[PDB]
Every structure is written in C-alpha cells, then in structure tokens.
Design a protein around this ligand. Structure first.
Ligand code: HEM
Ligand SMILES: *[C@@H]1O[C@H](CO)[C@@H](O[C@@H]2O[C@H](CO)[C@@H](O[C@H]3O[C@H](CO)[C@@H](O)[C@H](O)[C@@H]3O)[C@H](O)[C@H]2NC(C)=O)[C@H](O)[C@H]1NC(C)=O
Ligand SMILES: *[C@@H]1O[C@H](CO)[C@@H](O[C@@H]2O[C@H](CO)[C@@H](O[C@H]3O[C@H](CO)[C@@H](O)[C@H](O)[C@@H]3O)[C@H](O)[C@H]2NC(C)=O)[C@H](O)[C@H]1NC(C)=O
Ligand SMILES: *[C@@H]1O[C@H](CO)[C@@H](O[C@@H]2O[C@H](CO)[C@@H](O)[C@H](O)[C@H]2NC(C)=O)[C@H](O)[C@H]1NC(C)=O
Ligand SMILES: *[C@H]1O[C@H](CO)[C@@H](O[C@@H]2O[C@H](CO)[C@@H](O)[C@H](O)[C@H]2NC(C)=O)[C@H](O)[C@H]1NC(C)=O
Ligand SMILES: O=C(NO)c1ccccc1
Ligand SMILES: [Ca+2]
Length: 595
C-alpha cells in the first residue's frame, strides 16, 4: 500500500453521517475519505519535494552542495538586487481598490497555515539563533551578503525557523518531510471561527444562548462590536506601544493582527455573524443558540465563497479564468480538495500588491486630520490605532477610496515589507518578507521554476535568450540569470511573479495555472459548496446572489456612501451611492415555521 501512514499532529473524533453542517476541523466533508480537507494534516504535494539530502534538508544549508551544479544565491541578495525599489511614485493600480489586496489576504488565510516549529521555549535556541546566527536543527538563518546596510546595523543575519511538519515536531527520518496546513482546506470561514474545537468554543458567547460570537468588553466602536482581546502575554501588540498597551485580537486565525487592515476585516466579519445571528432569532424564535450559531455561520461561509468566486477571481485569473475554472457542475467525490504546498507560495503574489501607506478618511472621504496617512510599517501588530484613534469607519473608507499597489517588474515589493517588517517572536521592525519568502520556498523543499513551467504545460527556458522572451524583459532576465546560473534553480515565488500579467487579470500564465487549479479543486470537491443542490434551499439561493461587499459594510458600520463595485477603482463622490440603494440579504427563505 501507499504511504497510507502518518498523522500524529492529528486530533481525531467522529462523523455523524447525515449532518447538515461542516465540522470545525473540516473532517467528514468527504464521505469515502473522512480526513480529506481537514486541519492539521500535511499539505498536499502536486510533485515530489526537492531537498539537499533527499529527505529533509533544504537547498542552501550545506555550503559545499550545489543545486544542479551551482550555489543557490542567498535569499536577501535576490531581495536586494531584484525585488526592492526606492521610488513609490506611479506604482498604484489605476483600477483596483485597496480592498482588492485585502480580500486576498483574507482568503490565503482561510485556506492555509504553516506554523513554524517551536520546541525551544525557555531555551537559548531562540537566542542561539537570533543573537548568534548559528544554523542547526530548526534554526535556518537568513544570512546577509556583503554591501548590505543591515549588516552595518542589525548583525550577521535575520533569524528564521523552519516550518512545522507532520507526524511529530522532533527528529524524523524516512519519507520526505511534509509541512503542515493548520486550517481547513475548504473555503469555509475558519478564519472567523477557528479550525479547532478547542478554539471555536473560546470564540463563542456561550454564557448566552443566542449563538453570538464573543465580543470585546473593554472597548466598543461608537456602540459597535470589537474582536475580543487575547490573554497570551507577552502579546507583542503592546510592545510596539508600551505606553498604550493594547493587546492583539483573538480570532479564528492567529494572524488577524499582523496588520491593522486585516484586523479591520476580521471585525467586519464578526459583527456580521452577530447581525445575522440575532436577526435569525427574530424570524425563527424557537431556535437554540447552537442552531443560530450554525445557520448564521453556514451563511457567512456562503458570503465568502460567492464574493471570492464571483467578484474576486475573475479580475485576477483575468481571461485565464475560464481555461481553469469551468462552470459549476456539482460536487465530485473524486476530487482532492486539499491545499498543495506550492499554492501556499503561489498566493504570496498578493505581497506585491501592498502599498507603502495606510490612509484614514472622514465622512466626506477627506484626510482624517493631521496624521491621517501613516507608513505601513507602523501598523504591524498595531491594535491601539483602531481602539484609540477613530475605530474602523475611517479605516474602512480607506480600503474603498484607496488603491492597491500594482505589481510591476521594476518595482516589486514595497520597502515597508522588504526592509522594515516586524515579527511577533522578536522585537525589531527590520525583517524582509521577500527574503523570508524565498527562504520558505526552500525550507518546504519546493521544485524549481522550470519544473512548474513544465507541470502547467508551459515552455521552459534554458537560456538568457529563452528567459528574456518568456519574461518579456531583458534586464530582469539578466539579473535572474546572474544569480541563479540557470532558470532551473529559480525559486518559484520569484519565478511566478516575474512573468508579465495575463490579459485582464493580475498574474501571469504560470501562477494563473497554479491558482486556477487550486480553486477549481476546492470548489468541485466541497460537499458544502453553496451552489450544491441540497446545502441551501432553492429560494435561499436566489436570495444570496444578491450580496455585495458593499452591503456588508453598510450593515456593519456608519459609512453611508459606498460604491456598487468595491473591488475596482472608484472615486468619491461620483462612483459613490448611499447605502439605502444597495441590495440586501433577504433572510426569509430561511425563516422557519414548524421546526
Ligand atoms: C499589508 C499586507 C500583508 C502583510 C503585512 C503580510 C505579511 C506576511 C508574513 C509575515 C507572512 C509569514 C511568511 C513566512 O514565514 O513564510 C505572510 C505569509 C503569507 N502571506 Fe502575507 N501579508 C500581507 C498580504 C498578503 C496578501 C494580500 C496575500 C494574498 C493575496 C498574502 C498571502 C500570504 C501567503 C500565502 C503566506 C504563507 C501562508 C501560510 O501558508 O502559512 N499575504 N504574510
Ligand atoms: C503610543 O500610544 C500613545 C497613546 O496610546 C500615543 O500617545 C498619545 O498620542 C498623542 C501624543 O502625541 C496624544 O494625542 C493627542 O493629544 C496631543 C496633545 O497631548 C495632541 O497635540 C495631538 O494632536 C493628539 O491628537 C495623546 O495625549 C497621547 N497619549 C498619552 C497617554 O500620552 C503615542 O504617540 C504612541 N507612541 C508610540 C511610540 O507609538
Ligand atoms: C476596471 O476593472 C473592471 C473589472 O476588471 C472592468 O469592468 C468589467 O468589464 C467587464 C469586461 O470584461 C464587464 O463584463 C461583464 O458584462 C456583463 C455585465 O454588463 C456580464 O453579463 C458579464 O458577466 C461580464 O462579466 C463588466 O462590466 C465589468 N466586470 C464585472 C465583473 O461586471 C472595468 O472596465 C475596469 N475599468 C476600466 C476603466 O478599465
Ligand atoms: C469528477 O471530478 C474528477 C476530477 O478529479 C474528474 O476526473 C477526470 O476523470 C477522467 C476520466 O474521464 C480522469 O482520467 C481524470 O482524472 C479527470 N479528467 C481529466 C481531463 O483530467 C471526473 O471526470 C469528474 N467526473 C464527473 C462525472 O463529475
Ligand atoms: C455576550 O452575551 C451577553 C449577551 O449580550 C453579554 O451580556 C451583556 O453585556 C453587556 C455589557 O457587557 C450588557 O448589554 C449586559 O450586561 C448584557 N446583556 C445581556 C442581554 O445579557 C456578554 O457581555 C457577551 N459575552 C461576552 C463574553 O462578551
Ligand atoms: O502569516 C502572516 N500573515 O499572512 C503572519 C505570520 C506571523 C507573524 C505575522 C503575520
Ligand atoms: Ca478554511
């Protein structure tokens, strides 16, 4: 038999064979094979892993060893000589709002999570790594090259730890090391509810039987909900500001707090759960807290799927969408809904769409006062700005009137993320997401760029001349070549994002294929897909295709003018209409009588 083996990080409890709801861990979605899709299982491999020693070591761990005859360049150099750029002018997407970049972060979070390894608390393994930069075990440092400013100021390297893997978390030796996805593979709102039983419970307001999610006690937004604070101390949200001491938010996903905007979207989804939960009491008064919790939750899952598949993917896969995601013909038991290891790196394209600053706007959408615009890095793990500086209406207006950063070949990643990133584990805004990303592709044992080129049925460059034509850019290919000595060693992340963009989307051929495939799979393979004959009622369905993110805002904030098409660029006030004119969720085909 196949490696029908491992699974140790795995929880395990049972399946009700005809239940009308998703489990909290994704289990039992597939009847033949229960665990398919579930949290805490290895990420799927669409191709064999590629390691230095064959089973666990990454390329660029042993200095002597080469990859196809050449040394792999240090990550931070690829970052320095290619990704980075100085001039922020003319870098914004003329036809995408900031929201376009944010919604993506929400979905890449709903689908995947690889926790780093961590067995070294109260040991000097966190110090033997940050302070002394000595490789070993799960400490895989990002070493700085020569001619690097950070050298003169931060040390020899940036600490970095390898991602957790299945079976244990200690020394494993026989099949190749596979990394862990720690959230459910189906798009189901597990970022709002959590992917664990342990946790979905702590997020809920059980004390009361209305199916409410627990909200913040200490603070309220002009009389509105706030994700609840988190116990865990030292939470670094109070480190960026020791005077204010405002903890991070506790949510379905642990990353809710990296940045003030993602934290804002998490609050817009929480309120809406409660808004639906309490409206569902009004129409079906004999429904218990659990019943309310589920049908409410079950809906939000639909809101996310719809918007994702209706308003988000076609302006991304562009014209390529149809070549990958055929219309929906119904659940197919033979499809593997799992998230592949490569997709988790393919979705990081969203990193080139992050602008350099976040704006705050007043009611007539104007600069919210003196310091209304802040550079991005002052917002990593920043909760005090929301709590003590306006709430979210000013911020949410921002995501609409403002634009995303257009990914473009000469300016890729903003400096805010490439030079001034802040990590929870350490205490300096001084990391590089590009380098970190590039190392991560290696930690996970990812096959080179041309492998994937071949996998998707695309040509495969072997020469500068070949690379110039594919990338359609002479200088870019040249630098890629000077560093990788062969298109075959080019880390897929940099590989994928350097290809020009497909017509009407925001990503190239390769990446369109990888993403194109994954969402096709998580849709055809989701038994709880919302367009699935059975999940909701026929009337209930027509009710739902009437949703917009524009409506979501109106119901949960005090913004009165929003646009009809939140994702594409929209100016105020021409493209801004008042809430009263926006279609709404008719919760009646839900209204029960006789239950
Ligand atoms: C201001 C915006 C953003 C910030 C500050 C940010 C920050 C980060 C950080 C620190 C990591 C951990 C990386 C690693 O250790 O390997 C990460 C991972 C990641 N990000 Fe982002 N990110 C942002 C936006 C986005 C967007 C917009 C997308 C997609 C549209 C995205 C997709 C991903 C993916 C796929 C990962 C690896 C995830 C996993 O599987 O655990 N990110 N980000
Ligand atoms: C950490 O957060 C602090 C509060 O959470 C923040 O200090 C607060 O912000 C400013 C200080 O410049 C003050 O706010 C308003 O009042 C001043 C006059 O004092 C006005 O001139 C300003 O326009 C402003 O609207 C608050 O009084 C101050 N609060 C306290 C208790 O001092 C810090 O700025 C943050 N520090 C860091 C390093 O991020
Ligand atoms: C800014 O981006 C927008 C999306 O990329 C774009 O609007 C879209 O243009 C498409 C053409 O690809 C139109 O196509 C739709 O036509 C009818 C609706 O009348 C529908 O039956 C079809 O399904 C089809 O999607 C749309 O009108 C629009 N996109 C959507 C999803 O409706 C803008 O043109 C861009 N702005 C500029 C100035 O270029
Ligand atoms: C159900 O979905 C699966 C997707 O994995 C489909 O699998 C295809 O079936 C063919 C047989 O005709 C296999 O050779 C391939 O694995 C898949 N086709 C292609 C072109 O790759 C399956 O056909 C779907 N079937 C139904 C009835 O829905
Ligand atoms: C959710 O459960 C109940 C229901 O709202 C919350 O109790 C309310 O608390 C606020 C002030 O904290 C006041 O409206 C009343 O004291 C309570 N009203 C009712 C109807 O009970 C409780 O605060 C929430 N639970 C959590 C953990 O926040
Ligand atoms: O994975 C993140 N964002 O997508 C993230 C991870 C660790 C610390 C801060 C942010
Ligand atoms: Ca999920």
């Amino acid at each position: 038999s196949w490696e029908v083996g491992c699974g140790a990080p795995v929880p395990l409890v049972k399946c009700d064979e005809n239940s009308p709801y998703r489990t909290i861990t994704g289990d039992c979605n597939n009847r033949r094979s229960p665990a398919l899709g579930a949290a805490n299982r290895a990420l799927a491999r669409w191709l064999p892993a590629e390691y230095e020693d064959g089973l666990a070591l990454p390329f660029g761990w042993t200095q002597r060893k080469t990859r196809n005859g050449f040394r792999v360049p240090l990550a931070r150099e690829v970052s320095n000589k290619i990704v980075g750029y100085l001039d922020e002018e003319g870098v914004l997407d003329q036809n995408r709002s900031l929201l376009f970049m944010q919604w993506g972060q929400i979905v890449d979070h709903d689908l995947d999570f690889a926790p780093e390894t961590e067995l070294g608390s109260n040991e000097h393994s966190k110090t033997q790594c940050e302070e002394y930069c000595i490789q070993g075990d799960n400490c895989f440092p990002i070493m700085f090259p020569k001619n690097d400013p950070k050298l003169k100021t931060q040390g020899k390297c940036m600490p970095f730890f390898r991602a957790g893997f299945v079976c244990p978390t200690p020394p494993y030796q026989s099949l190749a090391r596979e990394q862990i996805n720690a959230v459910t593979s189906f798009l189901d709102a597990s970022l709002v509810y959590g992917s664990e039983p342990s946790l979905a419970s702590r997020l809920r307001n059980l004390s009361s039987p209305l199916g409410l999610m627990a909200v913040n006690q200490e603070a309220w937004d002009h009389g509105l909900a706030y994700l609840p604070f988190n116990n865990k101390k030292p939470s670094p949200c109070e480190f960026i500001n020791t005077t204010a001491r405002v903890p991070c938010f506790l949510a379905g996903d642990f990353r809710a707090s990296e940045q003030i905007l993602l934290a804002t979207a998490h609050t817009l989804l929480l309120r809406e759960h409660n808004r639906l939960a309490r409206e569902l009491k009004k129409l079906n008064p004999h429904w218990n807290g659990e019943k309310l919790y589920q049908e409410a939750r079950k809906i939000l899952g639909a809101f996310i799927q719809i918007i994702t598949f209706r308003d988000y993917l076609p302006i991304v896969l562009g014209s390529e969408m149809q070549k990958w995601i055929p219309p929906y013909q119904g659940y197919n038991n033979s499809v593997d809904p799992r998230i592949s290891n490569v997709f988790t790196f393919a979705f990081r394209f969203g990193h080139m769409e992050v602008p350099s600053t976040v704006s705050r706007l007043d009611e007539n959408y104007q600069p919210w006062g003196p310091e209304a615009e802040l550079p991005l890095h002052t917002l990593f793990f920043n909760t005090w700005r929301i709590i003590k500086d306006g709430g979210i209406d000013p911020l949410v207006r921002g995501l609409l009137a403002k634009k995303s950063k257009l990914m473009n070949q000469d300016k890729m990643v903003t400096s805010e993320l490439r030079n001034k990133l802040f990590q929870p584990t350490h205490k300096i805004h001084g990391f590089d997401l590009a380098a970190i990303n590039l190392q991560r592709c290696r930690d996970h044992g990812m096959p080179g760029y041309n492998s994937w080129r071949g996998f998707c049925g695309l040509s495969q460059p072997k020469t500068l001349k070949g690379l110039q034509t594919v990338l359609k850019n002479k200088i870019l290919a040249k630098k890629l070549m000077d560093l990788y000595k062969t298109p075959d060693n080019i880390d897929i992340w940099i590989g994928g994002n350097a290809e020009p963009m497909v017509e009407r989307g925001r990503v190239g051929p390769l990446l369109a294929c990888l993403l194109g495939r994954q969402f096709q799979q998580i849709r055809d393979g989701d038994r709880f897909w919302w367009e699935n004959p059975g999940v909701f009622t026929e009337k209930q369905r027509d009710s739902l295709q009437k949703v917009s993110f524009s409506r979501l805002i109106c119901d949960n904030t005090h913004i009165t003018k929003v646009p009809l098409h939140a994702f594409q660029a929209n100016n105020y006030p021409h493209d801004f209409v008042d809430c009263s004119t926006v279609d709404k969720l008719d919760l009646s085909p839900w209204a029960s009588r006789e239950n």
